[PDB]
Amino acid sequence: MKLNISFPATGCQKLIEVDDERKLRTFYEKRMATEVAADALGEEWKGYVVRISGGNDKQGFPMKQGVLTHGRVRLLLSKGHSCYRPRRTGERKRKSVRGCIVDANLSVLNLVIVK
Amino acid sequence: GISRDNWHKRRKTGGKRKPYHKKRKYELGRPAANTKIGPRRIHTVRVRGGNKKYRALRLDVGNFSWGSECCTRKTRIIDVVYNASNNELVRTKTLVKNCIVLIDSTPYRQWYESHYALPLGRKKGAKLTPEEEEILNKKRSKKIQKKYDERKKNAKISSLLEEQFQQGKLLACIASRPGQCGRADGYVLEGKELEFYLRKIKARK
Amino acid sequence: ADIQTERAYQKQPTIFQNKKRVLLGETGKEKLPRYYKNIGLGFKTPKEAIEGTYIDKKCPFTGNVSIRGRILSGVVTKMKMQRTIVIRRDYLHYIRKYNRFEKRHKNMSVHLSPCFRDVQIGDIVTVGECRPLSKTVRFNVLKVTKAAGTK
Amino acid sequence: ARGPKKHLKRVAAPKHWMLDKLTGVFAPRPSTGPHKLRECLPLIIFLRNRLKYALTGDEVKKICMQRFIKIDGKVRTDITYPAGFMDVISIDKTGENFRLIYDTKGRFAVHRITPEEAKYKLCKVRKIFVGTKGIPHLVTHDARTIRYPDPLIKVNDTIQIDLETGKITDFIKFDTGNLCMVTGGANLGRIGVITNRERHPGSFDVVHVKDANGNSFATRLSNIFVIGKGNKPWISLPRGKGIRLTIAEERDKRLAAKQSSG
RNA sequence: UCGCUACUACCGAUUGGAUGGUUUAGUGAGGCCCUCGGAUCGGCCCCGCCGGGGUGCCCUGGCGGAGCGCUGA
RNA sequence: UGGUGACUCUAGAUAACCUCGGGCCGAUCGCACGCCGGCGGCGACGACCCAUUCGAACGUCUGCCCUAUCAACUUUCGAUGGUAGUCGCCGUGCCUACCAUGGUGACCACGGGUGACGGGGAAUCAGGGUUCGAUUCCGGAGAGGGAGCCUGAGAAACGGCUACCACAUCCAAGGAAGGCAGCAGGCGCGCAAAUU
RNA sequence: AAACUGCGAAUGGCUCAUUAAAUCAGUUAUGGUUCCUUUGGUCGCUCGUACUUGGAUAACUGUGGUAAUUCU
């Protein structure tokens, strides 16, 4: 597991690799874009709350906000969706996409320090 | 996925055609979106040339025409009483063209009492509220007191209409196609057409 | 009532038949004005088209069809439908090798208006081209002359 | 196909353009415009093939792109703009003026014309309709619509358009005794006086025409363009006067005209 | 009438297997249309910390929060 | 008012409607520069509607090879017609409800076949004929086999997408990507056909 | 340069498997329909912040995932 933590006011990202379980036990079974308390990550994470903005799974497939599935799902994506940009007008491709609920089957957790 | 081609049929002699192409796009047909009674909901379609079709799914008002008085007002559609294609379309309350509907007579009653100064559809007890006393018993000028009584001679109504005005519900017949224009217009049934469809509804039960 | 045999109301759609009248109109006469029109190629509108009570939306004298294209002819063979008959056209096809002809025939289903009443089979009839009226019908009967074995 | 064609093969071109067989597979394919593509001469054929000004289909681009070419007094930067009948081509850098009139053999012709005549053209009225709060219109064979026409203009007549303003100046009506040019068929490019007009209601009117030598011919009504009132043409005419010579005397003209040499 | 060598095709056990075309019945991917659904994204409010303008009250700027508020996507 | 051979046409008048998945009535760019704070000249993009052009579609009439060891077919499940509508760009059993019982057939329907895409044409030929026409022009169809769509003025599009059946490429085994009846080229097939 | 926007990619090319009143040819019809474009018309014809309105998003910067794709 890695965290791509980004602070929007100072505009600096950081990739922080975490290999534990107790540091990520607060993050499980949560959806995308919910404000959790990133406190159990370490000693310097006291007053920080952090929202889960996205993520990839172990095979590289990104997460999407609508799908409430614990695993991967095929979806037919058009223009204006995520995880897909068309090459032709009206071209709609079916791609596979990981759901929005956080698991241990992820590689990156995009995190936004909101406070 | 409907196709309204002519080549999926048999010939006049009865022989069946082996087809010479697959289904082309200009042969298409779309599903019947049957217009029901409810608060308005239209969904626009994109048809050939980029034009618009207003596929209405629920309709509640529509302007109708009292033909013999030259009066077009926007009423409220109540019911479906008889449909001369299929009668399962009456129990489903589907508005199609040429289906006989019940409308609300109140905009025509307000026009009649304003134009002829006669009480229409009132009961015999005649409880007349003062807000329409001023249009039924107004103060008239010198040239207007003869104009209203000049209108008052030919202000007769066929008695089949006044029984509908008693209960407040006129019979009307839709003359526009609601699944293609999104409106439910039409006309009020008068005279021989009225006493045809009346006995059709009466013999229906 | 001699018209309204259907389940909807048969009505000539251009004519308004609910005009308000006065006491000399209700006591005088119940007059239905009728819609007729002139087909423009020298076919006389029959007096039955101007005096009838029939209602037909594909009649070429009272309904909504316009006659345009080929004007043809044929003789009547089968009158067994509602408002439409079967005429057969007879022609000779030239075969080039033998320098001879051969008898040939083709049928047409064709719409017969109710103004042409008392039509027997076996008489010549002029037909006129219009839009498709049904799956097989594209001509409309224009004038009926009687077979020479009449009187 | 699915949707419209954008190419023209060469053998499938109009015969009167006189494109040879061996120069290419494709022919210039006229743009949509005022004229039918069978009834027009594109501007690339008038510059390269007829006038011999250009030599390739890139020099027509280099000529038209200097805005040196006005077709009916408006500058044309399309080389496949369909110029048709009675269209005035003004080239001002050289000083010439042409009008596209058919000649006696069914083609167009290089007809140089005086700039005093190039301020007007004739059109033929094709449909007259009212509308839009009761305002009457014309439609001519160039798709020129001229609202508020004279009430005595009807269908198949001839107006005279002023080309700087777009307005009608005076007209000719369809009658007998009027001088007409045939603009279609096998009598195309022929000039004669209207003798007779036979009516066929539900079909086409046939208009019998009489030459200036006595040669009568007929056409359908749509191939008839009234040029003059009486016998006087309101436009100039080509070197031949719209009078088709039979091939015997057309041979005699050559074998007697070579004998003026030395 | 009656003796040698081989091919063509059919019958040909084997209820030998594999695949098409018509239909009986059952099932029915995927798209579209309808009725729902509502993950999320705004906006308008309401107070709290407060400036200026006008005259305790109104409009403005920074935010913050909460509500099954009430609307849009 | 104007028209056609013929309108239920074109215009006119009156009463109303006008779709929140909205109908137009310009919050746009450039070049020369100005005339008495206003008034500007040429263009470029747009734009509802009308006309035209380029078409497309659906129809009318007439026409095609062999076969009777194919003589009756079509009609539950639309076959022929009538009425009312649904759908559709629109005309129509196109489709649905209720009816009527019709429609085609030795003048060869219906069924099967074709070493059948149709024409313009080609070979041969006294005159008549016979046979070929995959092939560069016109028209149709189709992109491995059926099917369904998105976008758009236009496609049921395959050098677009989504499935299924048939093949088949990579793979770290979780997945990913395909479509030469385009030009070359390869294999196979075959008597039989050229340069990556 | 890039990327957004517009337009095209529905033409051209290839082949002849289907298909026998079908395709197609000649002849007519749309008075029974759609038509990007071009050309001409029309575009103060409506009686009811403007000396200029609102929110995003690429390219870009920066941090990543996947063995792998014109993936994101």
Side-chain angles (χ1 to χ4, degrees):
Chain A
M1 273 284 305
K2 298 108 171 179
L3 318 181
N4 183 52
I5 300 164
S6 44
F7 194 77
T10 192
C12 313
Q13 290 92 301
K14 192 182 173 181
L15 177 65
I16 298 180
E17 175 154 1
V18 166
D19 196 1
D20 256 356
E21 279 86 345
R22 309 307 309 169
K23 299 192 183 182
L24 321 166
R25 274 269 174 163
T26 179
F27 286 102
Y28 288 2
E29 318 164 349
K30 307 273 198 153
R31 286 158 176 159
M32 282 170 53
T34 195
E35 301 186 16
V36 308
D39 216 342
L41 286 183
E43 205 268 348
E44 49 268 36
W45 301 93
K46 289 306 194 309
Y48 290 118
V49 309
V50 156
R51 71 183 176 111
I52 318 171
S53 70
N56 296 261
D57 75 326
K58 288 208 165 200
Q59 284 89 2
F61 299 98
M63 281 169 76
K64 199 178 182 183
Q65 202 151 11
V67 190
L68 304 174
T69 299
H70 262 286
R72 203 177 298 142
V73 55
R74 321 281 312 250
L75 298 170
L76 181 48
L77 314 170
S78 39
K79 173 185 64 78
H81 282 66
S82 287
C83 315
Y84 164 74
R85 57 169 203 93
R87 279 95 173 101
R88 288 176 64 127
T89 310
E91 199 252 330
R92 315 181 311 180
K93 193 145 275 160
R94 187 167 318 233
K95 303 202 86 48
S96 66
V97 157
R98 159 69 204 247
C100 71
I101 308 173
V102 191
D103 285 330
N105 308 141
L106 304 190
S107 298
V108 175
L109 211 51
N110 318 319
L111 286 189
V112 190
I113 307 183
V114 308
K115 166 182 177 303
Chain B
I2 313 103
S3 189
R4 52 195 320 278
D5 47 353
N6 67 296
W7 48 259
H8 72 292
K9 311 272 297 194
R10 291 189 171 254
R11 283 161 195 144
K12 169 177 147 204
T13 68
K16 62 172 165 306
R17 312 184 172 86
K18 308 187 210 147
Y20 89 96
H21 54 289
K22 52 203 276 165
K23 298 189 189 176
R24 296 262 136 88
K25 178 196 156 67
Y26 61 87
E27 303 163 318
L28 70 89
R30 289 197 199 97
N34 310 294
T35 320
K36 270 77 174 181
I37 311 178
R40 162 157 76 204
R41 175 185 275 160
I42 321 182
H43 282 185
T44 54
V45 201
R46 206 269 201 183
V47 308
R48 293 282 301 282
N51 310 134
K52 289 166 115 191
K53 201 155 278 188
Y54 299 92
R55 182 73 34 100
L57 319 158
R58 290 150 192 228
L59 275 176
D60 214 348
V61 311
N63 69 317
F64 286 81
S65 194
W66 196 354
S68 63
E69 294 278 334
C70 187
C71 181
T72 309
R73 301 301 155 197
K74 181 152 87 161
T75 51
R76 161 164 144 262
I77 288 173
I78 301 282
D79 212 348
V80 169
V81 283
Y82 171 75
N83 193 7
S85 300
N86 191 358
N87 302 125
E88 289 285 278
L89 291 162
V90 173
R91 301 199 297 169
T92 327
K93 309 174 174 199
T94 289
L95 300 173
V96 287
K97 203 214 174 190
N98 220 37
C99 69
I100 311 296
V101 301
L102 275 178
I103 65 182
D104 218 342
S105 53
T106 299
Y108 301 109
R109 181 161 77 195
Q110 294 169 12
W111 179 85
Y112 194 86
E113 308 198 335
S114 175
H115 188 64
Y116 284 139
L118 262 292
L120 178 49
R122 297 299 193 276
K123 62 182 174 64
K124 180 56 58 64
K127 177 47 214 172
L128 187 47
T129 188
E131 298 85 1
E132 55 198 63
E133 278 272 336
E134 71 89 17
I135 50 184
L136 269 171
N137 305 133
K138 61 179 168 304
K139 183 250 281 172
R140 276 180 314 174
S141 297
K142 189 175 180 181
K143 313 179 187 297
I144 297 173
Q145 69 210 5
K146 61 191 206 315
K147 198 196 79 167
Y148 269 77
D149 287 85
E150 189 281 337
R151 288 179 180 170
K152 272 173 187 182
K153 40 182 61 53
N154 58 324
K156 64 172 187 65
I157 289 301
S158 42
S159 67
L160 300 179
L161 286 169
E162 283 186 325
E163 301 152 303
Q164 294 155 323
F165 271 101
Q166 282 314 117
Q167 305 151 355
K169 307 184 148 322
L170 286 167
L171 278 185
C173 180
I174 304 192
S176 90
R177 323 208 272 142
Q180 306 259 313
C181 73
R183 302 181 193 180
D185 300 357
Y187 43 83
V188 179
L189 284 190
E190 291 188 290
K192 282 201 173 313
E193 197 154 336
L194 172 60
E195 58 195 349
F196 174 79
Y197 281 111
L198 260 175
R199 61 173 146 92
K200 275 291 187 176
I201 298 157
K202 288 326 174 63
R204 172 60 198 174
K205 71 189 64 55
Chain C
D2 206 10
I3 308 162
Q4 326 293 327
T5 169
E6 324 278 346
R7 211 183 263 157
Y9 180 76
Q10 291 322 290
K11 159 198 65 161
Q12 194 153 79
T14 319
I15 284 295
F16 186 38
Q17 57 183 39
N18 281 323
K19 196 175 227 147
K20 272 185 87 172
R21 70 198 61 196
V22 303
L23 187 45
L24 61 98
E26 51 191 278
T27 310
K29 205 273 159 176
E30 181 72 31
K31 177 203 81 92
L32 264 178
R34 205 171 163 83
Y35 168 77
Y36 67 98
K37 73 150 158 295
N38 167 50
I39 283 173
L41 288 189
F43 299 112
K44 35 169 192 294
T45 49
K47 56 168 163 35
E48 188 63 39
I50 324 179
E51 291 186 311
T53 67
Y54 67 97
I55 279 168
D56 201 1
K57 45 154 190 189
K58 319 148 158 191
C59 167
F61 306 106
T62 47
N64 203 18
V65 286
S66 72
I67 302 308
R68 80 290 179 283
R70 322 187 161 263
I71 305 292
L72 311 179
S73 37
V75 312
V76 189
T77 52
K78 272 139 73 180
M79 326 169 58
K80 287 180 190 312
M81 285 179 285
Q82 298 202 302
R83 270 143 166 165
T84 168
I85 51 169
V86 172
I87 67 154
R88 75 181 279 166
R89 323 184 68 219
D90 279 299
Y91 59 99
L92 290 180
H93 183 242
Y94 179 71
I95 302 303
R96 191 186 178 178
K97 173 184 192 166
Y98 297 112
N99 295 111
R100 286 155 161 88
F101 303 90
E102 40 173 24
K103 212 78 73 176
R104 283 207 164 172
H105 93 289
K106 274 193 187 199
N107 283 19
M108 321 193 69
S109 311
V110 59
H111 184 251
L112 174 74
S113 324
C115 55
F116 299 119
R117 62 192 208 176
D118 315 329
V119 161
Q120 307 297 322
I121 80 186
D123 45 1
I124 312 102
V125 59
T126 309
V127 295
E129 198 194 336
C130 48
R131 60 165 210 264
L133 306 168
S134 46
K135 187 199 177 172
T136 67
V137 173
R138 283 96 157 104
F139 280 72
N140 230 324
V141 158
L142 293 187
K143 45 174 291 304
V144 200
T145 168
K146 320 292 165 168
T150 326
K151 64 184 169 176
Chain D
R2 322 171 258 159
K5 285 160 285 212
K6 299 200 260 279
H7 296 254
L8 191 76
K9 295 287 178 62
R10 202 169 187 93
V11 185
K15 174 100 164 84
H16 64 266
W17 294 358
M18 296 176 298
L19 306 184
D20 59 346
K21 288 213 296 187
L22 261 50
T23 318
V25 182
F26 305 97
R29 188 52 194 218
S31 303
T32 50
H35 298 277
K36 303 272 210 180
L37 80 87
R38 293 268 131 178
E39 284 276 321
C40 76
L41 189 84
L43 190 59
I44 178 167
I45 297 178
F46 196 64
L47 296 180
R48 179 183 65 207
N49 289 258
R50 295 300 107 85
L51 284 188
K52 323 287 214 312
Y53 274 137
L55 289 185
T56 47
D58 175 47
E59 305 190 43
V60 180
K61 189 87 175 166
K62 278 186 179 176
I63 288 161
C64 298
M65 271 294 139
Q66 295 151 341
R67 307 183 63 88
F68 278 159
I69 284 156
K70 308 178 61 179
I71 291 174
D72 285 2
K74 315 195 77 145
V75 158
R76 288 314 175 192
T77 37
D78 189 7
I79 75 182
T80 50
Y81 181 87
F85 189 45
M86 316 288 298
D87 279 13
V88 188
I89 312 167
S90 296
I91 289 162
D92 271 6
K93 181 57 71 177
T94 67
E96 303 146 291
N97 278 80
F98 310 97
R99 176 173 260 116
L100 286 183
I101 308 168
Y102 291 109
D103 62 344
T104 63
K105 271 167 180 166
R107 327 187 274 256
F108 279 113
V110 188
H111 181 39
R112 308 194 186 266
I113 208 59
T114 313
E116 273 75 48
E117 198 197 302
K119 293 186 181 297
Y120 73 95
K121 68 171 282 186
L122 314 176
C123 316
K124 158 166 169 155
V125 195
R126 268 207 183 151
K127 59 173 291 153
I128 293 181
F129 58 98
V130 312
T132 77
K133 301 185 171 178
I135 303 175
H137 298 72
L138 296 195
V139 166
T140 69
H141 75 290
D142 318 329
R144 290 189 162 254
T145 167
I146 306 109
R147 54 180 214 156
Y148 297 122
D150 217 353
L152 307 187
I153 309 174
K154 305 299 174 209
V155 182
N156 316 313
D157 307 311
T158 299
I159 67 183
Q160 174 184 328
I161 278 291
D162 187 19
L163 266 178
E164 199 259 12
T165 80
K167 280 90 166 180
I168 311 177
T169 63
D170 58 337
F171 59 91
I172 316 174
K173 216 187 261 209
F174 195 93
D175 285 303
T176 57
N178 282 146
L179 187 69
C180 77
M181 174 165 265
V182 172
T183 83
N187 309 314
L188 158 70
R190 293 181 92 188
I191 286 166
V193 194
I194 288 181
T195 297
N196 190 43
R197 187 260 292 269
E198 201 153 36
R199 294 216 163 184
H200 295 115
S203 314
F204 315 103
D205 289 12
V206 182
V207 185
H208 298 90
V209 189
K210 165 134 194 170
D211 213 348
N213 278 106
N215 287 255
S216 275
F217 51 93
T219 56
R220 286 179 184 192
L221 172 69
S222 70
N223 302 311
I224 281 296
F225 205 102
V226 191
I227 275 191
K229 174 78 209 75
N231 297 322
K232 274 81 59 178
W234 280 15
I235 51 158
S236 317
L237 302 186
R239 183 168 29 185
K241 289 300 191 175
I243 296 185
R244 171 181 285 165
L245 287 182
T246 76
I247 40 182
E249 53 188 358
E250 201 177 289
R251 153 200 85 198
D252 285 18
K253 193 200 181 73
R254 287 170 193 163
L255 290 166
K258 281 162 57 79
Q259 310 294 326
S260 76
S261 63

